[PDB]
Amino acid sequence: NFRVYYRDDPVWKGPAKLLEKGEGAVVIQDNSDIKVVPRRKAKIIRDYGK
Amino acid sequence: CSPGIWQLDCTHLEGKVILVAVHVASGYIEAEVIPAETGQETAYFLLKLAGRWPVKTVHTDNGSNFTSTTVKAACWWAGIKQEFGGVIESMNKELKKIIGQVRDQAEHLKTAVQMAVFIHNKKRKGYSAGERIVDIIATDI
Amino acid sequence: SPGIWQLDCTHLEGKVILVAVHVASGYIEAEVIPAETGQETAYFLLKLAGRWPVKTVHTDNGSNFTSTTVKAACWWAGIKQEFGGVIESMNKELKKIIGQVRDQAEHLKTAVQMAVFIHNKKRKGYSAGERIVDIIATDIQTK
Amino acid sequence: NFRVYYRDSRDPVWKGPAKLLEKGEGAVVIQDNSDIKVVPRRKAKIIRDYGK
Ligand SMILES: Cc1nc2ccccc2c(-c2ccc3c(c2)CCCO3)c1[C@H](OC(C)(C)C)C(=O)O
Ligand SMILES: Cc1nc2ccccc2c(-c2ccc3c(c2)CCCO3)c1[C@H](OC(C)(C)C)C(=O)O
Ligand SMILES: [Mg+2]
Ligand SMILES: [Mg+2]
């Protein structure tokens, strides 16, 4: 349902899988790497068109 | 082929970037002159296209704008599958041919581009491409 | 009538949004244009006329819609112009949807196109995007 | 079949539509409300009713 695009390198990475969401950060998994990303550095996007 | 398959590619004239989409089953096209051949401009073009038609799959070459993160985001949101790797290339040539035929009727290249899109989509074979896409999609409803 | 469109501009964030509505269906297209001029309106019209069978465009008397360049585009494309609340209602609907999704996008124009998508795809029992294709196809398939 | 929009009288506002009488190399001959005018090509925009 959700994919996350994010920054570390000024190019946006993704789609990363969304594991958990907090008010300040999101926990995501790209390939075999779990990252804690600030909310300002993350774009959570729904597959609205499905 | 499926009523939901589109091919996209860029061509170039007068130093400007022309982004072209073709509905494979009908030959219907849409095009825009974009200020730079970037993922951002391509993603914006796709969001507009997906709002008009039932865009299920887009096939492109591996141009960096087509493999970009922003295009991935747009296709995810709109529900578009991307496939990578000659209909649009043949269509690019035809579009440039029509543009050259009408170029001196317009000041700006983008004006001649949209005239050529109109001419291509309205020309009846018989149905025109513009009639074919609507007929194909309505039958798929 | 299958060929009647209404066009109008509305404004958000200091930017100009040019909106076209296919009256019979409720289908819309929109662009954020850099200025509310006849030049930009004529270019938008040439694009619209290439996609759909645009026979008549109804607008208010905004100077961009009465402009010489728009009259030139309508002459080339074969469009009849009529001057003087479907589009007004649609401006308010589009702005409502934009407001609902605005924080999901950096650029206003991205939110605009998300809002056009949302409006055109939402089913009532067809969507507006289904209605325009059905209406135009029926005209073609029965001639 | 053709309409001409043009600028004259040192006015940036586009006038017309006028009737096209001749498209020359450097000037166009037009008729606007029975007035015959000769305008430089660069001050004339000649547009065909392609959409019919
Ligand atoms: C700059 C410009 N100035 C004009 C001044 C007076 C009258 C018409 C124009 C046109 C024009 C408009 C519609 C049109 C065509 C040309 C040519 C045939 C199709 O319809 C343009 C065109 O530019 C815009 C379309 C962006 C306004 C152009 O590039 O030539
Ligand atoms: C600037 C920008 N940067 C990004 C960086 C990484 C990932 C995505 C984006 C998106 C984006 C793309 C498609 C999309 C949505 C947002 C939101 C949902 C619909 O699909 C944008 C958008 O801008 C462009 C569309 C011009 C690229 C935006 O305005 O936010
Ligand atoms: Mg290419
Ligand atoms: Mg208005």
Numbering used by the authors:
A (entry chain C): 222 to 229, 232 to 273
B (entry chain D): 56 to 140, 149 to 188, 193 to 208
C (entry chain B): 57 to 140, 149 to 188, 193 to 211
D (entry chain A): 222 to 273
Provide the authors' original text about this structure.
Integrase (IN) is the retroviral enzyme that is responsible for the insertion of the DNA copy of the viral RNA genome into a host cell chromosome. Allosteric HIV-1 integrase (IN) inhibitors (ALLINIs) are an emerging class of small molecules that disrupt viral maturation by inducing the aberrant multimerization of IN. ALLINIs bind with high affinity in a small pocket at the HIV-1 IN catalytic core domain (CCD) dimer interface. Projecting from their principal binding pocket on the IN CCD dimer, the compounds act as molecular glue by engaging a triad of invariant HIV-1 IN CTD residues, namely, Tyr226, Trp235, and Lys266, to nucleate the CTD-CCD interaction.
Following extensive screening, we were able to cocrystallize the CTD-CCD fusion with two highly potent ALLINIs: BI-D and PIR. The BI-D and PIR containing crystals diffracted X-rays to the resolution of 1.8 and 2.1 Å, respectively. 22 and 15 residues of the interdomain linker region were disordered in the BI-D and PIR cocrystals, respectively, suggesting that the linker was free to adopt variable conformations throughout the crystal lattices. ALLINIs share three chemical features that are attached to an aromatic scaffold: a bulky hydrophobic group (chromanyl and chlorophenyl in BI-D and PIR, respectively), a tert-butoxyl side chain, and an invariant carboxylate (shown in blue, green, and red, respectively). In addition to these well-characterized ALLINI-CCD interactions, our crystal structures now reveal details of the ALLINI-induced CTD-CCD interface. The aromatic scaffolds of the compounds (quinoline in BI-D and pyrrolopyridine in PIR [shown in black in Fig. 1A]) protrude sufficiently from the CCD dimer to make T-shaped π-π stacking interactions with the side chains of the invariant CTD residues Tyr226 and Trp235. Within the buried CCD dimer interface, the chromanyl of BI-D and the chlorophenyl of PIR engage in hydrophobic interactions with the side chain of CTD Ile268. FEP analyses revealed that the Lys266 side chain had a strong contribution to ALLINI binding, with corresponding ΔΔG values of 3.72 ± 0.54 and 3.63 ± 0.90 kcal/mol for the BI-D and PIR-induced interfaces, respectively. Thus, the side chain of Trp235 engaged in stable T-shaped π-π stacking with BI-D, contributing as much as 3.43 ± 1.1 kcal/mol of binding energy. Likewise, the side chain of the CCD residue Glu170 contributed more binding energy to BI-D (3.29 ± 1.06 kcal/mol) than to PIR (−0.28 ± 0.70 kcal/mol) due to stability of the salt bridge to Lys266 during the MD simulations. Moreover, according to the FEP analysis, we observed that the CCD residues Gln168, Thr174, and Glu170 were favorable for the recognition of BI-D, whereas the CCD residues Met178, Trp132, and Thr124 were favorable for the recognition of PIR.
